[PDB]
Amino acid sequence: MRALVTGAAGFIGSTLVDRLLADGHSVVGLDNFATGRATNLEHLADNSAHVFVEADIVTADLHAILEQHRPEVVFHLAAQIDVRRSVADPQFDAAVNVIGTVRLAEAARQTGVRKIVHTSSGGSIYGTPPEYPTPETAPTDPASPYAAGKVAGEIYLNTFRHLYGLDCSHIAPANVYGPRQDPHGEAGVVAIFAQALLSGKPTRVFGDGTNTRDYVFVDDVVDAFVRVSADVGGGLRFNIGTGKETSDRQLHSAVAAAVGGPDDPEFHPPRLGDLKRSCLDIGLAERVLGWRPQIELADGVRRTVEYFRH
Amino acid sequence: MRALVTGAAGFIGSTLVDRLLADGHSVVGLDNFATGRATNLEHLADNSAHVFVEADIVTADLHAILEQHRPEVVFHLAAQIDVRRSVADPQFDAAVNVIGTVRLAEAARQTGVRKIVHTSSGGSIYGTPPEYPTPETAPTDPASPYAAGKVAGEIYLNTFRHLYGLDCSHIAPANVYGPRQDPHGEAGVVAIFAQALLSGKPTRVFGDGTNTRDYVFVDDVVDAFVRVSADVGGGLRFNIGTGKETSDRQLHSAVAAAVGGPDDPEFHPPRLGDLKRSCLDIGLAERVLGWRPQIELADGVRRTVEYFRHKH
Ligand SMILES: NC(=O)c1ccc[n+]([C@@H]2O[C@H](COP(=O)([O-])OP(=O)(O)OC[C@H]3O[C@@H](n4cnc5c(N)ncnc54)[C@H](O)[C@@H]3O)[C@@H](O)[C@H]2O)c1
Ligand SMILES: NC(=O)c1ccc[n+]([C@@H]2O[C@H](COP(=O)([O-])OP(=O)(O)OC[C@H]3O[C@@H](n4cnc5c(N)ncnc54)[C@H](O)[C@@H]3O)[C@@H](O)[C@H]2O)c1
Ligand SMILES: CC(=O)N[C@H]1[C@@H](OP(=O)(O)OP(=O)(O)OC[C@H]2O[C@@H](n3ccc(=O)[nH]c3=O)[C@H](O)[C@@H]2O)O[C@H](CO)[C@H](O)[C@@H]1O
Ligand SMILES: CC(=O)N[C@H]1[C@@H](OP(=O)(O)OP(=O)(O)OC[C@H]2O[C@@H](n3ccc(=O)[nH]c3=O)[C@H](O)[C@@H]2O)O[C@H](CO)[C@H](O)[C@@H]1O
């Protein structure tokens, strides 16, 4: 297939590019380097089936880009990704996650694109849900601007689906980790932990350390993108995770055990916008797509730590 | 109380400003005249309880405006309102209806505002639900960017409620009609019909003319805004309509009757983004706010046509 990946210079995005290339597709990567890193893509310099486009989804001429490359599928991973930043600047977050998505769909509907695979946020869109693990049938209840924009994004794409028959599916991961996740970001705990501990620098958890997340390995998430790019799950969201909850303190202990060295994080004040718990029901992805997570946390932590050790 | 009304130079907004003033509130109106009209507010020139601010909600310093005026409640009616226009330019519609709303909420949470009463669209957000009349518990399913943005605005306001305890309620009207509705607008069938029939110009319905809407009179809608402005129905949407369906064809007949003369519309092809059917369940508003609509279509159409006469 002809694929286009927005946010391609990012953690998940660069990994997806790799997987799509390996499966024998041509890939157009698109990014503006807001949080992406050229270093994530530098191995592709002489890769025959990849071409990169530096563009801002909020302001670039996406029509011309899509008209030129005619991707069959757009994998849409470009977004403002930090919950806390979305709180500090809800307008910027909305501009990138809502307006960017709208412009993309509007360009896609006019350029014969078959399907947009959207990245929603399984971890956050449900807010505090009625039950854990949480199914896609649970109502959305965002409690950060980030979460709200992701929901809005789904709704808009569903709308384009009604209007024009531009197909869409919403990949909704929990907390994704693995190699290439920015260790210098303020989001991406596993990478933040791994880098700091490897270099003997201080680490922290927030509040009392009891917050849980559902940690799912990047390679697993990428396979879900691939499966859903076919003619399946039109207008549907797919929770992508493990159905297992790990505390911040438990996560720290696991990363410190892989790195060797101390397990003594500082405890800092709670962060406005951060949910206390997240656990995803992944039954729908198993039945419809045949998707199941292969990498357990202990294994994922080792792979991530060994990527940072070098 | 101190109130601020965005979209204040518009059809519903100017009417709301009138009601709030009559209730003894001080009122700041705000508008950029994208679709509004100076004539809608011209009578308020000498009223010291009303201040008007020309501002674009997309780019204006809403923080500074709200810091100056310190409204207790913000009634948010400023929006791109045309479904067809939202299809032609979804980006522009999203900027006004989503970004604009976010900017207002971010300003309101910093300036001691108690509550934002949002204007959603009961008419469009549900899409093709299995239930008519449609209750608020029915899942949203927008089929136009206008409707998507209205839903998106609800959600953002709900988010701000969680984050900061900035209270919100969403007034979700059906098809609103009455005095001050722009006769030369792209949207607003009652006004479109009255102006064309009163000056013997052509008129049209879309498709086979069987599309239905739930026509609710502006005064009834404005009353709901007032009731929901209090510390009640926090976080909730309220459908505001009559729970009765009228087809495009039947409405034409009703306006033709009120005007006099011929009942002979043209039939034009369906418009992309338009729902075929709309009717709201208004039970929640009755139970929670004590709100019921007073004006039946026949009475309301006569009132509207009267207004259009006095305006030569
Ligand atoms: N990491 C997780 O746990 C997780 C899980 C659920 C949702 N997501 C979503 O997955 C996607 C990938 O995020 P990630 O974890 O790889 O983080 P990331 O920051 O590494 O990737 C985001 C990428 O988007 C790019 N981008 C941002 N704004 C842009 C714009 N206006 N124009 C063009 N490119 C722009 C960034 O430069 C970056 O390359 C995002 O949409 C994110 O919201 C992440
Ligand atoms: N009329 C209906 O049948 C109906 C029913 C449901 C929802 N609504 C909603 O009710 C509200 C009022 O609509 P109306 O029927 O009075 O239409 P209107 O066009 O007369 O009123 C909308 C007002 O918003 C102003 N506005 C638009 N964009 C703005 C911006 N960027 N900055 C500042 N002001 C801006 C316009 O200039 C206008 O005065 C809107 O939010 C609309 O979507 C209308
Ligand atoms: C539950 C939730 O909303 N998850 C979403 C959110 O992840 P999060 O915002 O939850 O991710 P994060 O890496 O910022 O934090 C994850 C967890 O690790 C903890 N932590 C983090 C950093 C640190 O130095 N120490 C520490 O203890 C933090 O308290 C939290 O419980 O945003 C992601 C994109 O960025 C995805 O959209 C996730 O689905
Ligand atoms: C069902 C629905 O989505 N309703 C919303 C939508 O109203 P609408 O977009 O339905 O408003 P409109 O006045 O444009 O159309 C109302 C009805 O009148 C018909 N018609 C219109 C023009 C004409 O010349 N002849 C004719 O017959 C049209 O086919 C439709 O069935 O937008 C409004 C704001 O603008 C409100 O948000 C409404 O809640």
Short mmCIF file of N, CA and C and ligand atoms in Angstrom, two decimals, chain B residues 81-84 120-125 146 150 173-176 186-190 192-193 203-206 211-213 215 248-249 251 271 274-278, ligand 4:
data_model
loop_
_atom_site.label_atom_id
_atom_site.label_comp_id
_atom_site.label_asym_id
_atom_site.label_seq_id
_atom_site.Cartn_x
_atom_site.Cartn_y
_atom_site.Cartn_z
N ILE B 81 -23.12 29.29 12.24
CA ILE B 81 -24.39 28.63 12.48
C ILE B 81 -24.89 27.86 11.25
N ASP B 82 -24.21 27.98 10.11
CA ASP B 82 -24.75 27.41 8.88
C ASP B 82 -24.15 26.03 8.61
N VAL B 83 -25.04 25.02 8.50
CA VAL B 83 -24.62 23.65 8.28
C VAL B 83 -23.90 23.54 6.93
N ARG B 84 -24.47 24.17 5.90
CA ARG B 84 -23.92 24.09 4.56
C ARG B 84 -22.53 24.73 4.53
N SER B 120 -25.52 24.37 22.32
CA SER B 120 -25.27 23.22 21.48
C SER B 120 -26.29 23.23 20.34
N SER B 121 -26.47 22.10 19.67
CA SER B 121 -27.49 22.04 18.64
C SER B 121 -28.29 20.74 18.77
N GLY B 122 -29.39 20.81 19.52
CA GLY B 122 -30.28 19.67 19.69
C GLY B 122 -30.73 19.13 18.33
N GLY B 123 -30.83 20.03 17.35
CA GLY B 123 -31.30 19.69 16.02
C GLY B 123 -30.35 18.75 15.27
N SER B 124 -29.04 18.87 15.51
CA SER B 124 -28.11 18.24 14.58
C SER B 124 -27.21 17.18 15.22
N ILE B 125 -27.02 17.24 16.54
CA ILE B 125 -25.99 16.44 17.20
C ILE B 125 -26.33 14.95 17.22
N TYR B 146 -20.55 21.23 11.57
CA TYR B 146 -21.27 22.09 12.50
C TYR B 146 -21.66 21.31 13.75
N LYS B 150 -20.29 21.43 17.72
CA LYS B 150 -21.20 21.69 18.82
C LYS B 150 -20.99 20.65 19.93
N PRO B 173 -31.00 23.62 21.50
CA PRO B 173 -32.26 23.91 20.82
C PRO B 173 -32.47 23.07 19.56
N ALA B 174 -33.75 22.96 19.17
CA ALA B 174 -34.18 22.38 17.91
C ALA B 174 -34.05 23.44 16.81
N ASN B 175 -35.12 23.67 16.04
CA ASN B 175 -35.09 24.71 15.03
C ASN B 175 -35.80 25.96 15.56
N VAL B 176 -35.02 27.02 15.81
CA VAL B 176 -35.52 28.21 16.48
C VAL B 176 -35.94 29.23 15.42
N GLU B 186 -28.58 32.30 5.17
CA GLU B 186 -28.49 31.02 4.49
C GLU B 186 -29.29 29.98 5.27
N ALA B 187 -29.33 30.14 6.60
CA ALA B 187 -30.10 29.27 7.47
C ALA B 187 -31.30 30.04 8.01
N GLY B 188 -32.37 29.32 8.37
CA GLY B 188 -33.53 29.92 9.01
C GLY B 188 -34.73 29.96 8.06
N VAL B 189 -35.34 28.78 7.89
CA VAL B 189 -36.37 28.54 6.88
C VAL B 189 -37.58 29.44 7.11
N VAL B 190 -37.97 29.67 8.37
CA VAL B 190 -39.16 30.46 8.63
C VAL B 190 -38.95 31.88 8.10
N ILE B 192 -36.66 32.85 5.84
CA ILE B 192 -36.48 32.74 4.40
C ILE B 192 -37.85 32.77 3.72
N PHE B 193 -38.79 31.96 4.23
CA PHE B 193 -40.12 31.83 3.64
C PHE B 193 -40.90 33.14 3.78
N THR B 203 -39.73 30.43 -3.87
CA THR B 203 -39.36 29.66 -2.69
C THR B 203 -39.11 28.21 -3.09
N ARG B 204 -38.34 27.50 -2.26
CA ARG B 204 -38.01 26.12 -2.53
C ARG B 204 -38.02 25.31 -1.24
N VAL B 205 -38.29 24.01 -1.38
CA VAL B 205 -38.03 23.01 -0.37
C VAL B 205 -36.94 22.09 -0.92
N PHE B 206 -36.40 21.21 -0.08
CA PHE B 206 -35.35 20.32 -0.54
C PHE B 206 -35.86 18.89 -0.61
N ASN B 211 -38.61 16.21 4.77
CA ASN B 211 -37.74 16.49 5.91
C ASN B 211 -38.56 17.12 7.03
N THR B 212 -38.31 16.68 8.27
CA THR B 212 -39.00 17.28 9.41
C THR B 212 -38.01 17.95 10.36
N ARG B 213 -38.52 18.98 11.05
CA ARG B 213 -37.79 19.71 12.08
C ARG B 213 -38.76 19.97 13.23
N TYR B 215 -39.91 22.98 15.39
CA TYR B 215 -39.84 24.44 15.39
C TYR B 215 -40.26 25.00 16.75
N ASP B 248 -40.88 20.16 5.87
CA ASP B 248 -40.57 21.35 5.10
C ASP B 248 -41.82 21.82 4.36
N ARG B 249 -42.54 20.86 3.77
CA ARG B 249 -43.70 21.17 2.94
C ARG B 249 -44.80 21.79 3.80
N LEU B 251 -44.44 23.37 6.69
CA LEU B 251 -44.04 24.69 7.16
C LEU B 251 -44.34 25.73 6.09
N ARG B 271 -29.48 18.80 0.25
CA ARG B 271 -28.22 19.46 0.56
C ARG B 271 -27.36 18.54 1.42
N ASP B 274 -27.32 17.84 5.56
CA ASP B 274 -28.63 18.07 6.15
C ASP B 274 -29.25 16.75 6.61
N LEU B 275 -29.72 16.71 7.86
CA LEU B 275 -30.46 15.55 8.35
C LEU B 275 -31.88 15.58 7.80
N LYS B 276 -32.49 14.40 7.69
CA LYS B 276 -33.83 14.29 7.12
C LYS B 276 -34.89 14.51 8.20
N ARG B 277 -34.53 14.29 9.47
CA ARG B 277 -35.54 14.24 10.52
C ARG B 277 -34.95 14.72 11.84
N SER B 278 -35.75 15.49 12.60
CA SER B 278 -35.35 16.04 13.89
C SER B 278 -36.57 16.33 14.77
C1 LIG C 4 -31.92 19.38 12.16
C2 LIG C 4 -30.79 20.33 12.42
O1 LIG C 4 -29.64 20.06 12.10
N1 LIG C 4 -31.12 21.49 13.01
C3 LIG C 4 -30.17 22.56 13.25
C4 LIG C 4 -29.78 23.30 11.96
O2 LIG C 4 -30.95 23.74 11.32
P1 LIG C 4 -31.16 23.53 9.75
O3 LIG C 4 -29.82 23.48 9.08
O4 LIG C 4 -32.08 22.38 9.50
O5 LIG C 4 -31.91 24.90 9.36
P2 LIG C 4 -32.57 25.49 8.02
O6 LIG C 4 -33.48 26.60 8.41
O7 LIG C 4 -31.49 25.77 7.04
O8 LIG C 4 -33.43 24.24 7.49
C5 LIG C 4 -34.62 23.79 8.18
C6 LIG C 4 -35.45 22.95 7.24
O9 LIG C 4 -36.05 23.80 6.24
C7 LIG C 4 -35.81 23.31 4.94
N2 LIG C 4 -35.62 24.46 4.03
C8 LIG C 4 -34.60 25.36 4.21
C9 LIG C 4 -34.41 26.42 3.41
C10 LIG C 4 -35.32 26.65 2.32
O10 LIG C 4 -35.26 27.58 1.51
N3 LIG C 4 -36.33 25.71 2.20
C11 LIG C 4 -36.54 24.62 3.00
O11 LIG C 4 -37.47 23.85 2.81
C12 LIG C 4 -34.60 22.38 5.04
O12 LIG C 4 -34.71 21.41 4.02
C13 LIG C 4 -34.71 21.83 6.47
O13 LIG C 4 -35.40 20.59 6.55
O14 LIG C 4 -28.91 24.40 12.20
C14 LIG C 4 -29.51 25.38 13.08
C15 LIG C 4 -28.57 26.56 13.12
O15 LIG C 4 -28.48 27.16 11.82
C16 LIG C 4 -29.76 24.74 14.44
O16 LIG C 4 -28.52 24.33 15.01
C17 LIG C 4 -30.70 23.55 14.30
O17 LIG C 4 -30.87 22.87 15.54
#
